[PDB]
Amino acid sequence: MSAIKPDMKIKLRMEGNVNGHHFVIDGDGTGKPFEGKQSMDLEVKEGGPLPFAFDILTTAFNRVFAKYPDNIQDYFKQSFPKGYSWERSLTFEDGGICNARNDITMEGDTFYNKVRFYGTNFPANGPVMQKKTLKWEPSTEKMYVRDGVLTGDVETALLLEGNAHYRCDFRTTYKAKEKGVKLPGAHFVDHCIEILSHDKDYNKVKLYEHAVAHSGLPN
C-alpha cells in the first residue's frame, strides 16, 4: 500500500523571468504515476502574451509520473509522502541558458509544485525570442549518481520551423526531502512531452508527458 495512488491530481504555480520578461503561470492536472503519464491545463496569469516560445517552459511543468520496472529503484515514488526537489539547467546551442527548479509536495491525492524558471542570454533574433519552435523531440534521460546526487542528463532539441533543430542539453539534480532515500543505480528514462492544445498566444496550454524507465534492453 503506497502513499501514491494510481490516479493523482497535480496543482502548480510557476513564476519566472526570461530575457527580462516576468510571468506567472498556474496549472491543474492529473496523472497515473504507475503508467508514467500526466496531463495538465496551464494558464498564464501575469505577463501574457509571453514574448518567447512556450516550449522552453514545458519540461519544468515531476518524475513520479514515470513507469519504473521492478529492477530499477524508483527514487521518486520512494520520496513520498515528504517529497523531493529538482534543479535543472537548460543549455541551448546559441547561448541561451535557463535554470529551473521545482519543490514537489503531496497533500492527500494532490502533488503541489512550486516552480521557478529563469532564462537569459537568448539572442533577440533567435528561435526562442522569435517564437519559431514547434516541439521537443522525444528523448532519453541518462540517470546516474554524480557527487553523491541523483543526476539526469538529456541531449535533445526543439524542432523549429523550416526543417531545422535547435539543440539543448539538460542536466537535472534530484534530491529527496527525507534523509535516507536510497539512490538508484544508473538507468534511462524515455520521455515524450507534447502540447496537446493551446490558444492564440499560448495563454492556455494543455500539456502531456509520458515517461518510462528502463535499463537499455529490449527486455
Pairing of strands 21-32, 8-18: antiparallel
What is the chain's alpha carbon radius of gyration, rounded to the nearest angstrom? 17
Q: Supply 26's cell numbers.
A: 498556474
- CA distances 159 to 128, 134, 152, 203, Å, are 11, 5, 22, 21
Q: Are 188 and 216 in contact (CB under 8 A)?
A: yes
- CA distances 161 to 95, 123, 138, 150, 165, Å, are 19, 17, 17, 35, 8
Q: How was this structure determined?
A: X-ray
Residues contacting residue 153 through CB under 8 Å, at least 6 positions apart = 141, 142, 144, 169, 170, 171, 172
Q: Are 151 and 172 in contact (CB under 8 A)?
A: yes
Residues contacting residue 54 through CB under 8 Å, at least 6 positions apart = 195, 198, 202, 205
Q: How many CB atoms lie within 10 A of CB 206?
A: 15
Nearest to 83 by CA among 213, 178, 179: 178
Q: Are 119 and 97 in contact (CB under 8 A)?
A: yes
CA dihedral 58, 60, 62, 65 (to 10 degrees): 10
Rounded Cα distance, 100 and 95, in Å: 16
Nearest to 165 by CA among 188, 132, 143, 141: 132
Rounded Cα distance, 183 and 199, in Å: 41
Tell me, in Å, the resolution of the deposited structure: 1.0
Pairing of strands 8-18, 110-120: parallel
Q: Where are the beta strands (DSSP E) in the chain?
A: 8-18, 21-32, 37-46, 84-92, 97-107, 110-120, 133-136, 139-146, 149-160, 164-176, 187-198, 204-214
Q: 210-213: which pairs have CB atoms within 8 A and are 24 or more residues apart?
A: 210/36, 210/37, 211/36, 211/63, 211/65, 211/66, 211/67, 212/36, 212/66, 212/67, 213/36, 213/66, 213/67, 213/68, 213/69, 213/72, 213/74, 213/143, 213/187, 213/188, 213/189
